[PDB]
Design an enzyme around this catalytic site. Sequence first.
Site, PDB file in Angstrom:
ATOM      1  N   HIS A 108      -6.724   7.029  -1.943  1.00 19.30           N
ATOM      2  CA  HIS A 108      -7.534   6.001  -1.268  1.00 19.30           C
ATOM      3  C   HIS A 108      -6.840   5.149  -0.142  1.00 19.30           C
ATOM      4  CE1 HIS A 108      -5.999   2.708  -3.754  1.00 19.30           C
ATOM      5  NE2 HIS A 108      -6.582   1.882  -2.886  1.00 19.30           N
ATOM      6  N   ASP A 109      -5.523   4.876  -0.199  1.00 22.40           N
ATOM      7  CA  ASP A 109      -4.852   4.184   0.932  1.00 22.40           C
ATOM      8  C   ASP A 109      -3.843   5.147   1.598  1.00 22.40           C
ATOM      9  OD1 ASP A 109      -5.988   1.369   0.600  1.00 22.40           O
ATOM     10  OD2 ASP A 109      -4.551   1.039  -0.850  1.00 22.40           O
ATOM     11  N   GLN A 126      -5.396 -17.841  -3.295  1.00 22.38           N
ATOM     12  CA  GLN A 126      -5.576 -16.948  -4.424  1.00 22.38           C
ATOM     13  C   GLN A 126      -6.741 -17.470  -5.266  1.00 22.38           C
ATOM     14  OE1 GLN A 126      -4.336 -13.935  -6.007  1.00 22.38           O
ATOM     15  NE2 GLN A 126      -4.115 -13.699  -3.831  1.00 22.38           N
ATOM     16  N   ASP A 136      -9.204  -1.076  -7.026  1.00 24.10           N
ATOM     17  CA  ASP A 136      -8.387  -1.489  -5.893  1.00 24.10           C
ATOM     18  C   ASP A 136      -7.726  -2.848  -6.115  1.00 24.10           C
ATOM     19  OD1 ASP A 136      -7.256  -0.798  -3.488  1.00 24.10           O
ATOM     20  OD2 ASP A 136      -8.889  -1.403  -2.260  1.00 24.10           O
ATOM     21  N   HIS A 158       0.929   1.698  -5.617  1.00 18.02           N
ATOM     22  CA  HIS A 158      -0.436   1.142  -5.531  1.00 18.02           C
ATOM     23  C   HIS A 158      -1.475   2.241  -5.890  1.00 18.02           C
ATOM     24  CE1 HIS A 158      -3.988  -0.847  -4.214  1.00 18.02           C
ATOM     25  NE2 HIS A 158      -4.150  -0.091  -3.127  1.00 18.02           N
ATOM     26  N   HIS A 171       0.846  -1.206   0.000  1.00 14.06           N
ATOM     27  CA  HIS A 171       0.000   0.000   0.000  1.00 14.06           C
ATOM     28  C   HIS A 171       0.880   1.254   0.000  1.00 14.06           C
ATOM     29  CE1 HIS A 171      -3.152  -2.739   1.924  1.00 14.06           C
ATOM     30  NE2 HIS A 171      -3.723  -2.359   0.785  1.00 14.06           N
TER      31      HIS A 171
HETATM   32  C1  LIG Z   1      -3.270 -19.098   2.881  1.00 12.15           C
HETATM   33  C2  LIG Z   1      -4.032 -18.013   2.165  1.00 12.15           C
HETATM   34  C3  LIG Z   1      -5.403 -17.871   2.319  1.00 12.15           C
HETATM   35  C4  LIG Z   1      -6.082 -16.858   1.675  1.00 12.15           C
HETATM   36  C5  LIG Z   1      -5.370 -16.000   0.846  1.00 12.15           C
HETATM   37  C6  LIG Z   1      -6.089 -15.006  -0.032  1.00 12.15           C
HETATM   38  C7  LIG Z   1      -7.119 -14.058   0.500  1.00 12.15           C
HETATM   39  C8  LIG Z   1      -5.756 -13.562   0.132  1.00 12.15           C
HETATM   40  C9  LIG Z   1      -5.530 -12.727  -1.111  1.00 12.15           C
HETATM   41  O1  LIG Z   1      -5.734 -11.347  -0.777  1.00 12.15           O
HETATM   42  C10 LIG Z   1      -5.597 -10.418  -1.758  1.00 12.15           C
HETATM   43  C11 LIG Z   1      -5.876  -9.111  -1.390  1.00 12.15           C
HETATM   44  C12 LIG Z   1      -5.796  -8.177  -2.433  1.00 12.15           C
HETATM   45  N1  LIG Z   1      -6.121  -6.864  -2.234  1.00 12.15           N
HETATM   46  C13 LIG Z   1      -6.551  -6.330  -0.947  1.00 12.15           C
HETATM   47  C14 LIG Z   1      -5.420  -6.221   0.052  1.00 12.15           C
HETATM   48  N2  LIG Z   1      -5.534  -5.867   1.286  1.00 12.15           N
HETATM   49  N3  LIG Z   1      -4.305  -5.796   1.947  1.00 12.15           N
HETATM   50  C15 LIG Z   1      -3.308  -6.095   1.180  1.00 12.15           C
HETATM   51  C16 LIG Z   1      -1.878  -6.007   1.597  1.00 12.15           C
HETATM   52  S1  LIG Z   1      -3.771  -6.525  -0.433  1.00 12.15           S
HETATM   53  N4  LIG Z   1      -5.454  -8.523  -3.679  1.00 12.15           N
HETATM   54  C17 LIG Z   1      -5.180  -9.812  -3.898  1.00 12.15           C
HETATM   55  C18 LIG Z   1      -4.725 -10.193  -5.272  1.00 12.15           C
HETATM   56  N5  LIG Z   1      -5.241 -10.783  -2.985  1.00 12.15           N
HETATM   57  N6  LIG Z   1      -4.039 -16.098   0.690  1.00 12.15           N
HETATM   58  C19 LIG Z   1      -3.403 -17.093   1.332  1.00 12.15           C
HETATM   59 MG   LIG Z   2      -7.442   0.312   1.229  1.00 11.78          MG
HETATM   60 ZN   LIG Z   3      -5.981   0.069  -2.033  1.00 11.44          ZN
END
Ligand SMILES: Cc1ccc([C@H]2C[C@@H]2COc2cc(NCc3nnc(C)s3)nc(C)n2)nc1
Ligand SMILES: [Mg+2]
Ligand SMILES: [Zn+2]
Length: 320
Positions: free
Chosen positions: A115-116, A278, A226, A81, A77
């Site tokens: 925004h962030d 993901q 976002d 970004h 962030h």
């Molecule tokens: C073990 C495990 C379990 C679950 C997950 C997935 C939910 C996450 C993936 O979150 C994200 C968030 C995001 N943008 C918002 C954000 N907020 N804060 C940030 C820093 S990024 N953009 C993407 C491409 N992916 N990963 C691993």
């Molecule tokens: Mg934000």
């Molecule tokens: Zn953002």
Amino acid sequence: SICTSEEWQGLMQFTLPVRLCKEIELFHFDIGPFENMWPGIFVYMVHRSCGTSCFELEKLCRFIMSVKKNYRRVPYHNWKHAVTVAHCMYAILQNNHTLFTDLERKGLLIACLCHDLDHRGFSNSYLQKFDHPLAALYSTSTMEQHHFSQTVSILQLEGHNIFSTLSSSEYEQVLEIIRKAIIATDLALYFGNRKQLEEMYQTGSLNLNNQSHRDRVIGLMMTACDLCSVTKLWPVTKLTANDIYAEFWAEGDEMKKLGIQPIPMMDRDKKDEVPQGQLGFYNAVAIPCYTTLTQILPPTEPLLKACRDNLSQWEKVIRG
Ligand SMILES: Cc1ccc([C@H]2C[C@@H]2COc2cc(NCc3nnc(C)s3)nc(C)n2)nc1
Ligand SMILES: [Mg+2]
Ligand SMILES: [Zn+2]
């Protein structure tokens, strides 16, 4: 923090290479390789969306350089970004130009850039569970309210108010457009918003003239921007994901030092589960978002196409 005399002067004299002009119109445009040109890219985008006389060039160049100086050197962030999210908004606006008013186009570009603002690399749960001062100030959407408060403070800096030349009613309208757009970036609100919009589209009741509907549409546009890293070419989407997890794992590291068990997305010992998580994020968050955005604004279809390509890529990683 305020931008130095040297900084705002520098981007007033910037010129965008004509090779970029064609590329910046595409949804998949990656800004990453042009760091020195990021502030000037925001200027070109504003001047192409709302015209050369959109704002006072000096004021706009001061505002931009002060927004840059107030983003922290955190893994995701950051200033990078902000320009990525603003670029995605520009592409959406350019492809649906007469659906939005001049004041909405102005507000949304500035809302995306700010925004962030001043993000500490900590989520709303970290601040609420660990009783951080910001969470006592703002019960819900903790960082999103702070980002708005910070956006308003840069406008209250000497020679930074790009909006003062608006009529009193236009000024309060733009400041409300921005507040709502920034709050909509709290992913906790997205799920409710997308559900209502999907309902209004299927039944045939969605009407862009109805201000309540218009606000929900704008909110979905902010979510789409976002998360637009999922709409880039696979190598770019991959390197950005390394930055997202670099910030999530750093928050889990802070919890582990305090004797606290983080969720798997914020645990660096759970790296193996990133492909599967993901996949889940694409299935439950990214794909529905771009599917609903394409249903409402059909020129944004390339975003759903690109997100679907990266979904197929994450599935490929999982399969071996
Ligand atoms: C073990 C495990 C379990 C679950 C997950 C997935 C939910 C996450 C993936 O979150 C994200 C968030 C995001 N943008 C918002 C954000 N907020 N804060 C940030 C820093 S990024 N953009 C993407 C491409 N992916 N990963 C691993
Ligand atoms: Mg934000
Ligand atoms: Zn953002």
